[PDB]
Amino acid sequence: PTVFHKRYLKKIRDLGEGHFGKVSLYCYDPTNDGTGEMVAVKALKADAGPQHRSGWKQEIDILRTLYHEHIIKYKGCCEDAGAASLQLVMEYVPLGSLRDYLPRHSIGLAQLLLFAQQICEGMAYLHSQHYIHRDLAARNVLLDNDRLVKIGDFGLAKAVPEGHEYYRVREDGDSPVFWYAPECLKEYKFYYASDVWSFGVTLYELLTHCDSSQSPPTKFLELIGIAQGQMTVLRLTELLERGERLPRPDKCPAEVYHLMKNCWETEASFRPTFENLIPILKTVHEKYQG
Numbered sequence: 001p002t003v004f005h006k007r008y009l010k011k012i013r014d015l016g017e018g019h020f021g022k023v024s025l026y027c028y029d030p031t032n033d034g035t036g037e038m039v040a041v042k043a044l045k046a047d048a049g050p051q052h053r054s055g056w057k058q059e060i061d062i063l064r065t066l067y068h069e070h071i072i073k074y075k076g077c078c079e080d081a082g083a084a085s086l087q088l089v090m091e092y093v094p095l096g097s098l099r100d101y102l103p104r105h106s107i108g109l110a111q112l113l114l115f116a117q118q119i120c121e122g123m124a125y126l127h128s129q130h131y132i133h134r135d136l137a138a139r140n141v142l143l144d145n146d147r148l149v150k151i152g153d154f155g156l157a158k159a160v161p162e163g164h165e166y167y168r169v170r171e172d173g174d175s176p177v178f179w180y181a182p183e184c185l186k187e188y189k190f191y192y193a194s195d196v197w198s199f200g201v202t203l204y205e206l207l208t209h210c211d212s213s214q215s216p217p218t219k220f221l222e223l224i225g226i227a228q229g230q231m232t233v234l235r236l237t238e239l240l241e242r243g244e245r246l247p248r249p250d251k252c253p254a255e256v257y258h259l260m261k262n263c264w265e266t267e268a269s270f271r272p273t274f275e276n277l278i279p280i281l282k283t284v285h286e287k288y289q290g
C-alpha cells in the first residue's frame with residue numbers, strides 16, 4: 001500500500017541476485033540527514049519474460065497481504081521506471097541469511113531448534129493463507145537477531161487453488177531440485193507436504209551449519225556423479241525412490257534426525273504438516289535448551 005519515492009533512495013550494497021530477481025540494500029532518507037531507514041529492495045530484471053513479469057506482480061501481491069513475526073516485512077513499493085515494473089521494498093534483516101551466517105558463527109543445537117520451530121510457525125501461517133513457498137532453503141531464512149528468524153524470498157511462492165491439494169509447476173532450469181520431494185521431480189505437482197520435504201532439507205542445512213562441503217547439492221552430486229548427460233534429476237529421483245537420503249549431520253541427535261527422515265517420507269501424506277511440527281519442535285527445543 002505504501003509508496004517509496006525514488007529521490008530519497010540511496011543504494012548501499014547488493015544483497016543477493018538470481019536469474020530474474022535481485023535484492024539490494026538502500027538507505028531511504030527523506031531529510032538527507034541522519035534519520036534514514038535501511039531497506040531491502042527486490043527488483044525484477046528488465047530482460048525477464050512475460051511469465052516472470054506476471055509472476056512478479058503475483059509475488060508483490062502475496063507479500064502485500066502476508067503478515068507474520070517469522071515472515072519478512074513488506075514496507076511498500078516504488079516505481080522502477082528503468083524496468084517498467086515495480087520494486088518491492090522490505091525491511092532490512094541485518095544479520096542476513098542463515099546460509100551466510102552459520103558457517104561464520106558457532107551456534108548451539110538449542111538455538112538451531114528454536115530457528116527450526118520459528119521456520120515452521122511462519123510456514124504453517126503461509127499454508128493457512130493457502131500459499132506454497134516452493135523455495136524453502138537456509139539461503140531464504142533471514143536472521144533478525146540471536147533469537148529471531150524470518151522467511152525471506154517469495155520468488156516461487158504460489159496460491160494453492162481452492163479445489164486442489166497441489167499446484168502444477170512445469171519445471172525450469174532454476175528449480176531448487178536438491179530441496180525437492182520426489183512428487184515435484186517426477187509429476188511436477190507441488191503439495192503443502194512438498195514444502196515440508198524442503199523444511200527437512202533446511203533443517204539438515206542448519207544442523208551442518210550450512211557447511212558448503214556438506215550442502216545438499218554437494219552430497220547428492222557425490223551420490224549421482226557428474227557425467228550423467230541431461231539425467232541429474234532422473235538419477236536423483238531414483239536414489240530418493242530407493243530410500244537414499246542425506247546423512248545424519250555430525251552432532252545431530254538421533255530423534256532430530258528421525259524427525260528429518262519423517263519430513264523426507266517418499267509418500268507425501270505420511271509427512272507431518274507444519275502445524276504438527278510446531279508442538280513437537282516446541283518440546284524438542286525445551287529439552288535441549290536445558
Ligand SMILES: COc1ccc(OC)c(Sc2ccc3nnc(-c4cnn(C)c4)n3n2)c1
Nearest residue numbers: 015016021022023040090092093140152153
Ligand atoms: C532476489 O533474491 C532474494 C534472495 C533472498 C531473499 O531473502 C533471503 C529475498 S527477500 C529479502 C527481504 C529482506 C532482506 N534483508 N536482507 C536480505 C537478503 C540478504 N541476502 N539476500 C540474498 C537477501 N533480504 N531479503 C530476495
